[PDB]
Subunit: 406 residues, 3 copies
């Protein structure tokens, strides 16, 4: 417990900068059915379920656009990966490997990965020798469709977001600035004056480099973080396998009457598949909108609310791509070594009451100082860090101390 005090104030004298990951899926496997295998205005039965599959397939492109296609203007490649001591080598993409993903992005696409249909349709669809129709024939009607924005296009949106978050700050307003100077403005957004960063820059950079190194150390070796994306791929691949099991094994299970039971059994199996696809879309839409609002709040700016864009007070955020999802590298500030100091509302000198121009009056026991409330940086009391108004008699809790005029 931290209890009352009419005499004291708590101020932190240390801090630490932490980088933490948040994993959010935004997309889902776009499934479509060619009902001719199940001027063609409409079939009566298979069309009603396939129009819904088309509806959610368009929603996946809508979700991916709403999370990644939030900005377009190109900040050109950074590309040096040093930025005043902050090691961004884990985060910027390189042409040294022709995929041009970041080293962390490559790990996301390694751990989140695929006797199943998402495998079999791809093994069927050779970029040449195969087409949509020939494999809708070779495999009875079920298809997975191309994404509007592929992994590399999503990676280019991530690259532009990274360059725009490092070379400048997304709002305010917004114009290009050096990086440690930008984080000094992030400090001023927290409530800590800018000078606190420039004089701790190597320590802040070392804390950042340690946290960013342990992120990549954790992703592969401690896999318990990547589960949220393993689910969306595996459980939908399972959905396609469970459908095809009933559509392939139940050919020798379940004339006109026997046929009208078997085919309607296939339609009942399709209804079983479609209804849970439409239910999985309820999670994907919610998590995609969460990723979109955290893109606007954490990456495209600096958030006012706490524990939303990572734990602690928000500093900034960086995006990284993943199969059907995005990872937010939330950089946050948290104070440490809080300590109680005796405080006063005003300082009395020569019969006049002085108030801090910004900050608080605090004492080490023997002398009084003026200090910013959000970090212990004490200063002598002067005529240019205080302002005068009123009398030493009208104030409750006023205390006597000398005030200097340099």
């Amino acid at each position: 417990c931290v209890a009352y005090s009419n005499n004291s104030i708590a101020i932190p004298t240390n801090f630490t900068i932490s980088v933490t990951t948040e994993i959010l899926p935004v997309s889902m496997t776009k499934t479509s059915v060619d009902c001719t295998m199940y001027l063609l205005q409409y079939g009566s039965f298979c069309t009603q379920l396939n129009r819904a599959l088309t509806g959610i397939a368009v929603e996946q492109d809508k979700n991916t656009q709403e999370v990644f296609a939030q900005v377009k203007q190109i900040y050109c490649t950074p590309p040096i990966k040093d930025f005043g001591g902050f090691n961004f080598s884990q985060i910027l993409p390189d042409p040294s490997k022709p995929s041009k993903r970041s080293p962390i992005e490559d790990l996301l696409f390694n751990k989140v990965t695929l006797a199943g249909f998402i495998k079999q349709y791809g093994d069927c669809l050779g970029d040449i020798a195969a087409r949509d129709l020939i494999c809708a024939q070779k495999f009875n009607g079920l298809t997975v469709l191309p994404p509007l924005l592929t992994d590399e296009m999503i990676a280019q949106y991530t690259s532009a977001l990274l360059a725009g978050t490092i070379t400048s700050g997304w709002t305010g307003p917004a114009l290009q600035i050096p990086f440690p100077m930008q984080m000094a403005y992030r400090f001023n957004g927290i409530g800590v004056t800018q000078n606190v960063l420039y004089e701790n820059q190597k320590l802040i950079a070392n804390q950042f480099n340690s946290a960013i190194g342990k992120i990549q150390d954790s992703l592969s070796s401690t896999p318990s973080a990547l589960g949220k994306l393993q689910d969306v791929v595996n459980q939908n691949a399972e959905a396609l396998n469970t459908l095809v099991k009933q559509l392939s094994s139940n050919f020798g299970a379940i004339a006109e009457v026997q046929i009208d039971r078997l085919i309607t059994g296939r339609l009942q199996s399709l209804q079983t598949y479609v209804t849970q696809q439409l239910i999985r879309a309820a999670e994907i839409r919610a998590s995609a909108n969460l990723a979109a609002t955290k893109m606007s709040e954490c990456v495209l700016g600096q958030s006012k609310r706490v524990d939303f864009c990572g734990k602690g007070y928000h500093l900034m955020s960086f995006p990284q791509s993943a199969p059907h999802g995005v990872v937010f590298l939330h950089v946050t500030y948290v104070p440490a070594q809080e300590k109680n100091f005796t405080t006063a509302p005003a300082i009395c000198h020569d019969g006049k009451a002085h108030f801090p121009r910004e900050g608080v009056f605090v004492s080490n026991g023997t002398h009084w100082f003026v200090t910013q409330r959000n970090f212990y940086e004490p200063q002598i009391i002067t005529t240019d860090n205080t302002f005068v108004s009123g009398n030493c008699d009208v104030v409750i809790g006023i205390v006597n101390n000398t005030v200097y005029d340099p």
Copy 2:
């Protein structure tokens, strides 16, 4: 009407601090039915309505958590109830009465209170000698279930919120500070400099004490405010009585055919009850979310929007518990004695144009001053409350006045 002026500005020279109540219900009576009185995978008829009763019963715990369980960290008991002259004796709980509710909270639980089922099931459920099953037998199937968070647990959440709002300010950022100093920051959040509070502290405290006294004076003697909570308890107790009337009197009203009309009549009566319970939940969910967002906006911080967290410009807010609801004690600031003063954009001296470092230039008719725009606190024009830029010729509306250098 207040009309145009290119020459003048309106500034208030007085203010008053008001405390006002907002009453919001957040919970509803959790009803459940044991269908055996109406490996047991499912009954066909009574199960479908009882699963919905279970669904809204879980929603009541969800609503109560969303409004009260918004924070957990304990600020220990205050417990002195003086805080620089502001009398919080009406608001803090005491162990002098073993319920440990606040004196106002005890009045809320007095006026909002209960030949009816919410009474009869409780008179049936003795803490010993009775159980759930024996009274589901003694009274045909209808039950009201325990809340996840009882009145005392809700009171402990209120106690922690009060201690966290008095001992510190919930964001920014957030750390413990003396109370009148915290309200000085609330003044600076309004737009009035902090010194205006410390020199009016006894007057502000007296206004607060008068308003907080009239709140408790009003609740019991002028009951027209408590109606919003009387409704949610009485109209749901009426719903249970109206159900049981048809389930008990219509035993001698409405063989296999006569039975299949009577029992389905009981199910039709249950549908009548369940559908309006699910409609009452529409009000309870909306008001609980309103209480949750006003907990985050009014209690867990200071609101930027006006007339939301009480009438006038928002200062702070304090929670108090009530049967199935929460009361917000909105403390707000409103300016008074607005007055028009002649104003100028810049002051010309020695051929240079000076602008106020913050505030406006105003004149009493004979001399020019610099003043904060949000409260009339005039000051002499100096070189440290103005900044220089430009010429006396390029400015429209510029005026001549001396500027001093102390």
Copy 3:
């Protein structure tokens, strides 16, 4: 592309003020049917569709209130239309024409205007000699009902909003101020110091007058902007004509059996009309809520988000009425002539590190200055625009330059 730099910062040295239009429909034609032509507790068939028509008719009054009836307090007529050089003659209403609409509002009601039922029912309803019932008889049952707030009442709400946005600023807080001084506060809200406006006031006013003149020049001559309101009137008038075509021509198309096909055909035609009226309400509700939130964000204040209240950084907004809609005259600021200057974190003098009290250190190549980051307004480095803390050794990127003490 704009690429990296650890050494430089981009600052704009020019700007331009633009006025742009956003058009939003908020209302829809309130249709009602007297089912006696198609103690009267209910008819079975026509009542179910007419209760829905009543439901959306009440929603149109709700939408119009939510967008226009957001404030009530009267700022009296301005009425001079000069406001420091900004020509508001296009925007304020005049009694020189007895409608008392603004010259732009009169153009909105000219271009958005009406062998059709919205015409025929009005030609039927003479203010005298006709009534609701006699024309529900002369034309079989279909009616369009009066709006709760007419065009002139909506115009009075617009007039009060204009007076409240010009004579004062709607929050903060809010009190009456001269107009160019208010826009100086709008500049400070953008991030540009107030003095930048007063010394460019004639240029800013000329840019405003040119944009506001081209708005009215565009509306009538280049009609491609007014289409969003042409649709909501014409396509609903078409809906009433398409209904009446089936209700009037199909009297000689489609005894008890032939009657029970014909009348149900009229009900099927009514279902065709009602379902698309309820679908058009989905657009009208969304656009009305967009107009309501942009009334609160753009007119009743100044928006923090970009490209929402017009393109560029938001300055202010003015409302104008239109048939079933509102037009927002978004005034926005956008910087121009961005230029790169060499920058430094701190300035070293006499062994002490100095930081800018607000702004950045920049150099013309030969000398160092301090400047606000959001507009190029350079200043000499002094002891009253910098503050001292730390040493010249602990800072990365520090540079040497003299600092003056006036």
